[PDB]
């Protein structure tokens, strides 16, 4: 399922993700109410570099289940197709 596809690709996500994609992903995940203000503010403020924020986003989104993984992969595919292509999505 989607959560697998996330969990064998953690290193590439850490290494290749950009900050604008982070902002858009937080907006998308907050819009669908799967994530609330607490953790989004936590990842935005407690972390300095973009890659640590990617780590926090991933290890916060994986335990939720397959639906959140499907949402985020759909978003990454639909607004940033090139990154999904170089990630093999």
By CB under 8 A, name the binding residues for a copy of itself: 10-11, 14-21, 23-24, 27-28, 30-31, 33-39, 41-42, 45-46, 48-52, 55, 59-60, 63-68, 79-83, 85-86
Least distance (Å) from a copy of itself to the CB of residue 73? Answer: 15
- Cβ-contact 88, 29 below 8 angstroms: no
Rounded alpha-carbon distances, angstroms, from residue 67 to 39, 48, 52, 70:
18, 28, 23, 5
In which residue are the tokens 């959140």 written? 68
CA–CA dist 28, 23 (Å, integer): 9
CB of 88 to a copy of itself, least distance (A): 10
Least CB distance from residue 5 to a copy of itself, whole Å?
14
């Amino acid at each position: 399922m989607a959560d697998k596809v996330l969990k064998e690709k953690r290193k590439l996500f850490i290494r290749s993700m950009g900050e604008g994609t982070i902002n858009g992903l937080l907006d998308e995940l907050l819009q669908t109410r799967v994530l609330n203000k607490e953790e989004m503010e936590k990842v935005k403020r407690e972390n300095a570099t973009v890659m640590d924020k990617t780590r926090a986003l991933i290890d916060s989104v994986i335990p939720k289940g397959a639906q959140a993984c499907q949402i985020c992969i759909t978003y990454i595919c639909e607004e940033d197709s090139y990154l999904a292509g170089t990630l093999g999505l």
